[PDB]
Amino acid sequence: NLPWVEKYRPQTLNDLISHQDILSTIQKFINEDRLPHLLLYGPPGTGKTSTILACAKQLYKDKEFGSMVLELNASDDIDIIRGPILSFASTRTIFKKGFKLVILDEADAMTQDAQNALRRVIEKFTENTRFCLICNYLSKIIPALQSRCTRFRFGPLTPELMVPRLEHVVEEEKVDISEDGMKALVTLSSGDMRRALNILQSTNMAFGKVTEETVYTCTGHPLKSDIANILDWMLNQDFTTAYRNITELKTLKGLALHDILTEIHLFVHRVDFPSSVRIHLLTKMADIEYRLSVGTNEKIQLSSLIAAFQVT
Template identity: 60%
Template sequence: MEDAITLMDVDDDTKGKNVVVESTPDTKATPWVEKYRPHSLADVAAHRDIVDTIDRLTNENKLPHLLLYGPPGTGKTSTILAVARKLYGSQMSNMVLELNASDERGIDIVRQQIQDFSSTRSLTFGVKLPIKLVLLDEADAMTKDAQFALRRVIEKYTKSTRFALICNHVNKIIPALQSRCTRFRFAPLDAVHVRERLKHVIQAERLDVTEDGITALVKLSNGDMRKTLNILQSTHMAYEHLTEEAIYLCTGNPLPKDVEQISYWLLNESFSTSFKRISDMKTRKGLAVVDIIREVTMFVFKISMPPNIRILLINDLADIEYRLTFGCNDKLQLGSLISTFARARAALVAAAK
């Protein structure tokens, strides 16, 4: 690929802020998302096609600049850190610069830290690839000026440095950067992979989790492994026996049976009765209206109704959820929810005639 590089100047004032340092495995105080983060490419739970492709490129010393994108908790950062461990081993702290662009998003970070790191020459004792690696997490948070500056740095230092950009929204990365990287999309994890990894953690931590509890964790995660482990750990702190109810109570999400009950009231009861009963359940169980609306929206997809009425109902529910995100009054929006179903119910009756 190129001649081996021989020397590297390491700044002493980094204070461990931007350089990847292998953490010592800790015990009870360690968040499980870090404790059970994959340490090798073989440990990555899903996206085997992507992982195998990157693994093959590293074995052949053909690693390109990478752009890994997709929803949170799908293994983007874990994959590239596993690649770095494989490439550099004990030299990882000297050969890898890790930055989080959501904290350091301006043009100065590109002109100073990234350019300084890329321009210095590196020790190559015991590493498989004689080039350095810059990991830029949350790259979609970078300003446009910073991204254009990064493009020039990538062009200038391609012979000595590889860049790995990680982001959630690829459309926020300028085309000039996208075209210089090999792109890999990390989709939400399949329920099978989430369940498999979840059972591994449960066994390792010797937790008492029921089967319906595992199903609830998988459902609430929506393919986000980080979210799954955070819910599992927080529920374990509150309950010894982890059931479906305990998990839903800990997260504040309405239970499936509660969603069915609320949907029944919305479809069958009068405005005043529905408002009173839903308000009572909301207060008693500490539910948020926005969570009720999200779950009811999912329930709407399951019930039988004409497509045009379903579309109108879902659009109205989306409008209510949107208003709630801007801090609109909960009681008013709960009233809007009930009114929306009253209109849908009237439309269903009219369609039946």
């Protein structure tokens, strides 16, 4: 039915979590009519399009929200700048007094010429239309454009902050969550509340109970024991019987070499090596990843990885 990523949206500005400094500064901006152009950037699912929407609903009303807020996605399309944006920023709204708000979601998919045009539009109409850009890679935004507006990095949510909200969601709903299912959910989410709530809802709706095994099977994430097995084949076996074992496991479950390689890197850093061997393992694994990035055979790259581990 209704997804939990929408039912538990923070409707106000204080229901946001883990960004108390940024939220307090934006609230102070609102109180003093000093709201500058904002550039909210960071990893997905961290609360950007919710922060600015709460700020808007606090700033305008619900009927002024169609004629004084231009929610525009930048991934649909230089014409979008001199088109609707320049025609929205330059004109007043008839009876309403106050600035307007333009919300450019995915503001980093814009070509550089479009960002030049938009920077001039911003610079011109800066007292009747406040722009709020939203992106994931501030490096993709022209330094010129970013200079114009104050920047806010919405980093990922630490697991201490985000666990109470998940506990409130669990208690409000009826989810029999284990003491580690929460841990295997926080880990797999990797710090974006959207993915955490989505995974939780989908697994609870598919299997009926969340634990450290059910979430790992619902998301198809390679289990830790399997990667331990692969590292053991590589580290304590013959070359050919390791190739055979690893290939059989890699085809048994759906498993590529990118994921094997990532988890094996984490394990190389986990387990104890003479610290002059992991310099070799790390170098070779970072070369195998580049080799795989160009569309090569995985039957020769897997063998190269086993060769890398055969320094032992």
